[PDB]
Design a protein around this ligand. Sequence first.
Ligand SMILES: Cc1cc2nc3c(=O)[nH]c(=O)nc-3n(C[C@H](O)[C@H](O)[C@H](O)COP(=O)(O)OP(=O)(O)OC[C@H]3O[C@@H](n4cnc5c(N)ncnc54)[C@H](O)[C@@H]3O)c2cc1C
Ligand SMILES: Cc1cc2nc3c(=O)[nH]c(=O)nc-3n(C[C@H](O)[C@H](O)[C@H](O)COP(=O)(O)OP(=O)(O)OC[C@H]3O[C@@H](n4cnc5c(N)ncnc54)[C@H](O)[C@@H]3O)c2cc1C
Ligand SMILES: Cc1ncc(C[n+]2c([C@@](C)(O)OO)sc(CCOP(=O)(O)OP(=O)(O)O)c2C)c(N)n1
Ligand SMILES: Cc1ncc(C[n+]2c([C@@](C)(O)OO)sc(CCOP(=O)(O)OP(=O)(O)O)c2C)c(N)n1
Ligand SMILES: COc1nc(C)nc(NC(=O)NS(=O)(=O)c2ccccc2OCCCl)n1
Ligand SMILES: COc1nc(C)nc(NC(=O)NS(=O)(=O)c2ccccc2OCCCl)n1
Ligand SMILES: [Mg+2]
Ligand SMILES: [Mg+2]
Ligand SMILES: [Mg+2]
Ligand SMILES: [Mg+2]
Lengths: 582, 582
Amino acid sequence: TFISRFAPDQPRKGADILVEALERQGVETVFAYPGGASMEIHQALTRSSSIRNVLPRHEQGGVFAAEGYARSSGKPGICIATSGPGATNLVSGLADALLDSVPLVAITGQVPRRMIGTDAFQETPIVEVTRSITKHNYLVMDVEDIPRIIEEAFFLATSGRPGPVLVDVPKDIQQQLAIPNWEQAMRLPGYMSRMPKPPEDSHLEQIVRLISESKKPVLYVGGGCLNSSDELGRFVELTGIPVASTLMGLGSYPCDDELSLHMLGMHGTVYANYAVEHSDLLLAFGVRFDDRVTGKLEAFASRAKIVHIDIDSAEIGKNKTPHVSVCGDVKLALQGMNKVLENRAEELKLDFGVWRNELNVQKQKFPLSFKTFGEAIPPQYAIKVLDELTDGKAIISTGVGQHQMWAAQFYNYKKPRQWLSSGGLGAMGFGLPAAIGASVANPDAIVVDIDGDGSFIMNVQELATIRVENLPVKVLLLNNQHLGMVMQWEDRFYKANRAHTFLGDPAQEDEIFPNMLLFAAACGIPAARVTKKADLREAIQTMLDTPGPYLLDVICPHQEHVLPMIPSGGTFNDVITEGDGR
Amino acid sequence: TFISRFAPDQPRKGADILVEALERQGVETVFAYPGGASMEIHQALTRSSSIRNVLPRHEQGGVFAAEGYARSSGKPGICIATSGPGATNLVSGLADALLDSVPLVAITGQVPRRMIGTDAFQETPIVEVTRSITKHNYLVMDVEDIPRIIEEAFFLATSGRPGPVLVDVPKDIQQQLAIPNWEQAMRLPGYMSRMPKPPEDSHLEQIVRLISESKKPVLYVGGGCLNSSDELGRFVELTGIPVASTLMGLGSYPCDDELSLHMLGMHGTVYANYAVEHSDLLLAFGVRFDDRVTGKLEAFASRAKIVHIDIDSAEIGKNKTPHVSVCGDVKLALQGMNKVLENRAEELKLDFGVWRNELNVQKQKFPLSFKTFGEAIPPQYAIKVLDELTDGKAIISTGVGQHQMWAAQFYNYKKPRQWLSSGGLGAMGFGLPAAIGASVANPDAIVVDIDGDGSFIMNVQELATIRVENLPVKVLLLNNQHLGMVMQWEDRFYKANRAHTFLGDPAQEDEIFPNMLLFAAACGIPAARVTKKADLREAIQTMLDTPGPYLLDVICPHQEHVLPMIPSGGTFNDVITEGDGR
Ligand SMILES: Cc1cc2nc3c(=O)[nH]c(=O)nc-3n(C[C@H](O)[C@H](O)[C@H](O)COP(=O)(O)OP(=O)(O)OC[C@H]3O[C@@H](n4cnc5c(N)ncnc54)[C@H](O)[C@@H]3O)c2cc1C
Ligand SMILES: Cc1cc2nc3c(=O)[nH]c(=O)nc-3n(C[C@H](O)[C@H](O)[C@H](O)COP(=O)(O)OP(=O)(O)OC[C@H]3O[C@@H](n4cnc5c(N)ncnc54)[C@H](O)[C@@H]3O)c2cc1C
Ligand SMILES: Cc1ncc(C[n+]2c([C@@](C)(O)OO)sc(CCOP(=O)(O)OP(=O)(O)O)c2C)c(N)n1
Ligand SMILES: Cc1ncc(C[n+]2c([C@@](C)(O)OO)sc(CCOP(=O)(O)OP(=O)(O)O)c2C)c(N)n1
Ligand SMILES: COc1nc(C)nc(NC(=O)NS(=O)(=O)c2ccccc2OCCCl)n1
Ligand SMILES: COc1nc(C)nc(NC(=O)NS(=O)(=O)c2ccccc2OCCCl)n1
Ligand SMILES: [Mg+2]
Ligand SMILES: [Mg+2]
Ligand SMILES: [Mg+2]
Ligand SMILES: [Mg+2]
């Protein structure tokens, strides 16, 4: 039973109605940066005792923190910005949340309703700008609609395939006095009538049947399984099917497990891509068959019966055409299939030990490998040490690039929502603000931003946020002085011709530039640099043991390449397994 | 004080709420064609005792009748159609009403809300289709919004620059029971804050000043003056400025008046186009400077100070850049200027008799002329006889083409809203259904559809409507067996090479085809054909004296050309004054 701060017959500002609408959704944290068009909302936030605001230093930091909050908790992330330049600073995070299916509610202040369309001060038609990069958006045109629209926004953001919803609120609506009606029904008849139903036994029986008739089955799990950790684990016990995971699915099935093929795709392991290449049954659970994973679509799982379980009917058959399809929640499909598998256990007699042994041969012939040069620090090794010293229990956020791939390859995530990374859009600058949101959502967890030097500097201003909010955010900065992933493609395909990928100072070519330690010092954050591989273990331990925030500048040789690599649009026969920039 | 047919606490269907919403707007006549998605609305219409439905035989006839109703009365015309093929049949009339600024409210049934977007039975996304050809449109998503949206539709259609508004009503909303709230405020804050204010004396004084300083002033009046007949007439008394009128403005100033220059433009009189060509002050009242009137914009009124009074700020300076501009209702501007002119009468001493005499010389050297060949009926002469026998008091609707021009040139409209013609879009088939709407709105008036044989056959099915509704609609069919206006351009610019402009039967080339008398006979409408000019006067008199509907098939030589003609994009020096298809 909710307790309002206003009498049921007492008129309050629309901004107070909006804040209470957030309170009634269970919101405890927002990421709000004030401006003229949203001042009323910020005043109403100070009047709330249950909602805390984390003031970022850039609205892109605000939306990315809301993402990290959401990705690490399963709850919707809430960011708030003013009109115009505040709203446009949210755009990268909105697109990021849509491509990765992250539940997000973004609220933007807007000019007064009568000023809309007149090129008013700090006016941006943000509803038009963001229509194609949000799951849905709204322009509130009356204070009476605030309870309903906020409720619909949270429902749309969190139900079905999750995504971002933007709510544009004109300033005059924030000031207008009204008595809210919290009993209004939502106006989503089409959306609600097309929400997937529980999976029928008809479809679930056929899948278990295809499993018993197959000899080379491969699980292909992705971001849709983040809430099915227990069900997927039980499913693997009952079937013994090896698990290949996408970038977004990492941790749904434990990485340090015997049946784990780890990541597949462009930078997936040789044995995971091998398994899919030669499988006869592909169980595609919570995946969208993106080009990083499949390469050439015609060659992807070319001799496999493809079972695709997805909550979005539009994804089924979008790129790869399945044989069997189930449109529904993969959590429920796993539960139904687990019952059938448990009952018919002695009848089915499932044993894929011959297939698993064929894969474990590839696993030992072509494992993930890295080279140690003198006393230089291998980035892959630094992440393995972090995994060891944190016991694989840390929440990991990343930027985008080589360090992102190494953070995916060389850390054994035991649970979903430890892995917070921008996969579909791949937005640099995500790692630091995402760690802010993850730490606020999980204040007792070890939170480490494994960042690159290009990605880290893009939103370096959020170090001030970390200090002011006294968040124990650790930064493991893999510093190669380059835009590494673009540098790698220069080496492979452009004869190592450098086109603006060096991030240091060419006048002092052998100096680490910039000095990231002084960025941390500017914000009162203790920091250190490590260069010798012998010193790396104690340096990471110091970062972990030092209470509060900490930045560890880990210098790495830039000639490292992420391996293996299947070229874009290629097949398994095109996989690159050796070579670097030396 | 309105009297509802339901108790204020009694729930009724949304369809009954919609019909009462029409009743509360003063609606007495709708033009509604039933279908599955609008059956509920039609059931609710039979329960209304104050609203009469005129069932057309085609929804295009329905919307064009709503136009004729509106154009002839100043009230909004209301048409109703079912979803899908009913809605798409409204499209030509919606575009027609937008280009001519006709107040119109179109209501379309729609599939149930949950079916929208699923390619349901008879589903058309009519709101998307018609967004660019309506002033505004709505998709009603809750039964509670019906009172507000209907009120906003009528307000938007009739206020400012009038235009069509479409309201799309899903079938489930028509069936849902609710208690309407008729006190809801409209949500048009931007539109209402930008509605033009009464004209300031600052701007009105400057215009009267420019009048006293000019020696060759020309009034240039259009469709925006249809409600300023008295004010414009008083303005002409106080200034003695000659009046040139657009196609849409005909009748605002009486045609059979001494100061009337009649129509200007592509087929305007030589003296009207002369006056504008050599004017030093152009009073552009309620006009939009379209290409038919101006020709080459740089040459149009090239040596004139241009005063443009328009209620739409977007029209001021759109094609021609004025010197002085007033954004407001021309009715109020005329009233304000009339006060100034009346007070400073002896001070201003306005006399343009020198300019008027220079124009009356052109008026006598180059008047409107037509040629009589043997006993063949000149179409121009037929319209002059109709003018005489009706004493210039008939409501005239037309199709589009040569007959439309002759109906504009050779009938002296004494008041606005006697002239109902499609000017901006120029849609053939307008004349017959427009006469239906004009007769329903003016049941004691003489209503004559001056139609062409191509235009008349397009909506010939509305003859059944005329008989069933027992409307005294007269049809003066100027039958030249051709698509005359396109034929004229073939003669002038394509060496008379015929490209599908002959409407008769080439097997029986000298037979009148089709036999329009049998179309009228099929619908129990008395009819006659006249071919000899000597018989024309009695035939028209018989048409007028015979009570009820009547069709007069007036056979005309097809080689007639509308004269004069300024070629498209030409100047006054390019005017064509002689020649035909002989
Ligand atoms: C530099 C870089 C390199 C990359 N290389 C790789 C790579 O080598 N390998 C790799 O895997 N990725 C790689 N990616 C990531 C990549 O581009 C995509 O983000 C990722 O492959 C897609 O993950 P997904 O298939 O699990 O679909 P997601 O983006 O996670 O979407 C989830 C899918 O499951 C469905 N779903 C959601 N919820 C449910 C539910 N409850 N039940 C059923 N279905 C549900 C959704 O409708 C959607 O179809 C890389 C990214 C970057 C930036
Ligand atoms: C075959 C054919 C030939 C044609 N040839 C000619 C021709 O030779 N000559 C000719 O004149 N037309 C001709 N037309 C008609 C033509 O294409 C245009 O419809 C017409 O010229 C435009 O009329 P208008 O300038 O009065 O503007 P309208 O279409 O009547 O619009 C009214 C204008 O006044 C403004 N307004 C409305 N209400 C008010 C108010 N209360 N106060 C102030 N302003 C207001 C509106 O914003 C708008 O700018 C022809 C049409 C056809 C089909
Ligand atoms: C906002 C933004 N701008 C540019 C991008 C294009 N990319 C990349 C890519 C793979 O998306 O190529 O398309 S990765 C990358 C360079 C990463 O520099 P680093 O942070 O130092 O990490 P590393 O360990 O050295 O590799 C660039 C420039 C991007 N994704 N986001
Ligand atoms: C729905 C529609 N289709 C085609 C049209 C193109 N036009 C015309 C025009 C000027 O708009 O040329 O653009 S006029 C015209 C022929 C008129 O045949 P009539 O009715 O017999 O009259 P008349 O006395 O003989 O001239 C055509 C074909 C049109 N406007 N509407
Ligand atoms: C320096 O100007 C300033 N500074 C600050 C800190 N606040 C405000 N607020 C404000 O202008 N409110 S407003 O009247 O409703 C308003 C009117 C018109 C257009 C926009 C608009 O607001 C939306 C953007 Cl501020 N203005
Ligand atoms: C021959 O079928 C028929 N005939 C007639 C005369 N009426 C109806 N009515 C009807 O189908 N109503 S509906 O259930 O709500 C409905 C459901 C789905 C899609 C559309 C739809 O209606 C909108 C278009 Cl009819 N159907
Ligand atoms: Mg080592
Ligand atoms: Mg780098
Ligand atoms: Mg004669
Ligand atoms: Mg004709």
